[PDB]
Amino acid sequence: GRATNGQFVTKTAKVLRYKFVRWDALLIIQFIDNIGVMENPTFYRNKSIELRSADFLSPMLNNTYIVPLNGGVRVESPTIPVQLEVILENNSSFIQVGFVRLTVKNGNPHMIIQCNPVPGNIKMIKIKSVMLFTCLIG
Amino acid sequence: GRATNGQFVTKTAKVLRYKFVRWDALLIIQFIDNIGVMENPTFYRNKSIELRSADFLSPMLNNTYIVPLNGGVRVESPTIPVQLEVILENNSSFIQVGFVRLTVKNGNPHMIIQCNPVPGNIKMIKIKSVMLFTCLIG
Amino acid sequence: GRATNGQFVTKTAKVLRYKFVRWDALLIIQFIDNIGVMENPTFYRNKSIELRSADFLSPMLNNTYIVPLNGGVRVESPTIPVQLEVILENNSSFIQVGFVRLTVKNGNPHMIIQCNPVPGNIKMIKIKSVMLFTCLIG
């Protein structure tokens, strides 16, 4: 088939747009809000999916941030590594390889984001990578 | 098609279970032993594929650990990055981005795991990521 | 379908060979120049895609190296993480997780390679990973 639109919504009503192709047992899904572009012949701008403190579950354990989501598709994806920027409350920031999965809990999709220790509380995580998950359904 | 079960077996008779879809020229394969879950509404448990010293070939060179495998499918996959925990003989442990491929040697599948230097001998490598390889056959 | 050959060419006339499968809306493309092999029963050799200074655009900003390409397919891929070795002018070298995308600018394909700061000017970037992109067309 051709690519169908969809979205997830966060606790704070942020909308995470994606396109997907469902060929069961295969579901391939890309997030489309942050597709970077060359804005002129020599400059590449990255774009961020920006997730705030209030998008995550509390308490956070083991550098694992859980984003409960509503709507969208319901998959147990593999883990994909991403470029993260972790913004601390003191506006200090750390660039990291993050690891992202989609999982299902209580019939709800959740995005699992795992990263490294940071010296402070997190205000914001920015995903600077274009994320695509290839998933096996059943 | 829908997802078919399979497994690889290690030198020490550890069984590495996967599901795959074969649409030649495409083979997509996920390892399924360590699919993490949210065990309650706020906690995500990672699971490990645990590979011991005796699962690897000797001598090890250039932080490259080779796991000879029996059975399963026979692919030259791309490289996927993973979350590793490298357990040293002194039970010290290091969290790392590893890079994994499947390759074929002497008609046998081998899993290639590459990581960073550690200050000691390795007792165990745990893969904490859900691994899926998309492969091109011929 | 089965896997079709193709290539991209760099500013300096380096040829980057790939195989792909196009099932629109899906395009899956692997680079094939650097498929590593076990050369004997205990040794795995990585192979590099070697990109020189003159393959990149100037000026470089924010550890982002842009490789303008000619020919090949024209995709907005997701980001894939890779093993990089960054060779400096003083022949010092740094092993890094890089992040690679294919993007389109002025109807031309460009490879976007992003990595970490290095203490010097870059002479060469080697991609030691086998790269495969799964892409969504339209």
Could you say what the CATH architecture of chain A is?
A: Sandwich
Largest interface by residue count?
Answer: A-B, 29 and 26 residues
Stated plainly, the CATH topology of chain A is called: Adenovirus Type 5 Fiber Protein (Receptor Binding Domain)
- Determine and state the CATH class of chain A: Mainly Beta
The 3D shape of chain A can be described as: globular
The major pleated sheet of chain A works out as: 10 strands, antiparallel
User: How many alpha or pi helices of chain A?
Assistant: 0
Strand content of chain A: over 45%
Oligomer: homotrimer
Please give the order of strands in the largest beta sheet of chain A. Answer: 6-11-8-9-10-7-1-2-3-12
Kindly give the count of domains of chain A: 1
SSE string of chain A, helices as H and strands as E = EEEEEEEEEEEE
Broad structural category of chain A? mainly beta
Number of separate strands of chain A? 12
Distance between the termini of chain A: 20 Å
PDB class: viral protein
Keywords: viral protein, turkey hemorrhagic enteritis virus, beta-sandwich
Assembly: trimeric
Entry title: Structure of the carboxy-terminal domain of the turkey type 3 siadenovirus fibre
